[model samples]
Target: KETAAAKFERQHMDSSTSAASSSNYCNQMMKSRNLTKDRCKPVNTFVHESLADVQAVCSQKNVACKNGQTNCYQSYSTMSITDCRETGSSKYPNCAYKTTQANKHIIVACEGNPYVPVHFDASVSGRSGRSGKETAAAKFERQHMDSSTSAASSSNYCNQMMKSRNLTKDRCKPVNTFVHESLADVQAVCSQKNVACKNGQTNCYQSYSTMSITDCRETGSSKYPNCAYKTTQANKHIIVACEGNPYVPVHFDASV
Candidate 1:
């Protein structure tokens, strides 16, 4: 049988061990800004902010709970305070928003005291390969030269791009530009061409070649919707381009 003193000693050791473990965990988070900067880096969305606050309450919860567990039951312990001074006080002068330009998004995990850190680097905004060039002129040239599809003059045509051509001697003929209003348009065009191939000799070329679509939203904020479609077969090449406004074939490859 264990004496009263022995039982008390064992309980004390267990409590001491728990406190030490919790302390170490808290300290690790506090020391490294990267560990707890955004609060979302290490933990999930729901637990991120709460965990940040938990670091603060852990000390108090370690002693008060009836079960002797450090876990927090009250929400007050997890409340986050966004200090305006950190951003520079609004009432005082000399406060301005700072933005950074980044190429790719970065996800960071931070360990610290009050919270964890998580953020995406969306820094690069205005910087791009074609920033200053005359977009309308370039697009016009692309329409004629691309050979995949002609620029269907419409608001929706913004969604498409030109195609690739097999420029070898045997396949040296200029491929026709395909005009398409939407994905449905491309599907119909492909279906009609397939029927022609099945009926007799190679009317177009092969039965099918390549198909793709561009989401206009991916480009930027545009008032119009557009898409481009191209099809390649045996003897013939076709491009279907469409937009909301009136536009003509910038270039055609039916001759070659």
Candidate 2:
């Protein structure tokens, strides 16, 4: 006989986390959290914020729960979140899950004397790979920025890198690039030369200096779960889109 707030905290709160986890994060988390007792829990989400932050969602915005209850509310700001999705090959009790991270507004149900969060109803504004909000920025870094230069880019470079980085699932990302330079080097492109993006939008800028880049074009034989890429190294000027206060590069536009 535990309280709702305690239950919610046990299942969702993770402020004490040590940081980014490996691919098997879900498989271990579900079991450790007692979420997989008899069978696999198909889906569950975890919040990496403080319990206080999550509890505050219960009072932020009055929202309606899917069940037509008025005790629900949503957070005004995006919070760090992790989604644990059961994998197809997972067996009962074994309960494997694919872990996906995101930043989004969380919706919860409130109850009891303290009016704290009792349920995690939903996380809006993100999905897939790195899910929601500035995810495009995060995705841009995961899929584009690569400072690993070719010191150990062996025959298994793309294979190991793509899989280790959790990018070779569901579908093979056919075309990708890795800029072998510091992240700051790429951010500087946002202020180098203002120009237009491919879709004809403005906010684009070209780099002032030629940069080292590795083009990873997937081979025709590449299959899902096994992404194979043919690496082609080059030196070209890169173009990117920059936005927001700090003025950081948010999108990769082109190279010439």
Candidate 3:
């Protein structure tokens, strides 16, 4: 049986070899490590630190994890790391990754008598080269969060938003919601008890506040080349799907 700590090592610890120049480094490494066997692991990080030094993070002072656990610890020194995220065009059975290498303070969760790191929590305050490419989380924010939108917003809001956000490929999205809130406020909604999502995933979290939101449903007669939407305003706690290091909402699941 593979130990949890060992699995963490296999997945995260990559001390000897550094990330390669080829963008396919993450694609190759992720597959070679068997992370993409079942399905594409959406996002992952490879820590380029010695096994002993990385394990030593467990001995560092404990910090509260995103989910409020106290077992997570942050490293004292910044370390080399490579972050791999799925490219937008990637599909199942064939996973792809975009590499972002950085030198950052790593955080991990420790457990057992050995007090070894068992989870990769986060990274912060790093010096790294980023592609500045749009991430799924960022895309969700751009598409869904219309902080500037309000009660006096027009009926054309839905029509305009769909076009501006690039949601319509001339094929209308059947249903969508626009949340009117600041990114900071909406991102904070991830720190809570997650419930079952509409897709039956467990990554969904409900907002603490009944937020101001607008629902957009494609009208019955709406067709390609024309996306007519019926907009409805509401105030409710939104359920969202979240992922990644900073742990922000990546998808709007439902509202209640």
Candidate 4:
């Protein structure tokens, strides 16, 4: 099984390609990176910065995870990144994506003896605030919310989002979160108070303010290629578990 740190590296880290000028970057990458295994991963990010610099973010500034875990950290400096979004024409086994590049500060979860980045939480606007068509907040919502796990008053939201977002191809993604707050507001959680992680990780933190978010959970009856989901929207403080030597968030524990 892939560990959280390894999963984050597979999904988020990409230091080889410094330039993202080619239009076919996402198409080649999404497939070469194995994100197109069973189905197309709708949205994902790849950091163009050095892994060492990215890992150093764990010691930059402490932040609260969505599950209110204190084991997260935000980068002090902006870093190069590429966002890959699956095109509307994308179909399973033939996934296609649009690649966009930008500079942004990223947040991550960390843990372990040496303290390294174990998970990527989110990215914030850089000093220029110029993230083309998809802003950091937008990207965060697409990656985290569409595949989140949460209770829902009705299954309509999940039913529509899951299929529309292409998360039902190989199998249903168990859980995801879509935050409704501004980038600045969400970034401020780094300064919030600390709290115990749901999983008993000592490195958890909680936010000072409540946030508007939608949780998406796969329905029990969900079947591949025709999945169903439960959508629940509410204001809650999130908790996240951190690991690795970098002390970043690795798991989305829960929302309280």
Residue-level lDDT tens digits of model 2 in 132-205: 24345555666666553433256666665555344676777787666777666887787788888998988999
Q: Write down the worst ten-residue block by lDDT for model 4.
A: 143-152
Tens digits of per-residue lDDT for model 3, 160-190: 7676556787688888888877666888989
Q: Write the per-residue lDDT of candidate 1 for residues 1-256, one digit (tens) a residue.
A: 9543333222111221112223133223322323234332222111223232223222111121233432322221222221111123211122221121112211222223322232211111124432223233223233333222333444433332221211222322223333322223332332333222333433332214343322222223322223233333222344322222233222221211
What are the runs in model 1 whose C-alpha is more than 4 Å off?
1-98, 104-178, 193-256
Model 3 TM-score is: 0.48
| TM-score per model over all chains | 0.19, 0.48, 0.48, 0.49
Residue range 59-104, candidate 4, lDDT tens digits: 5555777678988876656778888999999889889899999878
**What CA root-mean-square deviation does each model show from the true structure?**
24.1, 14.1, 18.1, 17.9
* Residues forming the 10-long window of minimal summed lDDT in candidate 2: 126-135
Between prediction 1 and prediction 2, which has the larger lDDT?
2
State the TM-score for model 2: 0.48
Identify the leading candidate in terms of lDDT. Answer: 3
> With candidate 1 superimposed using the best TM-score fit, by how many Å does residue 32's alpha carbon deviate from the native?
32
Q: Is candidate 1 or candidate 3 better by TM-score?
A: 3
lDDT of each: 0.26, 0.74, 0.80, 0.69
Per-candidate count of clashing residue pairs (backbone under 3 Å): 52, 1, 0, 39
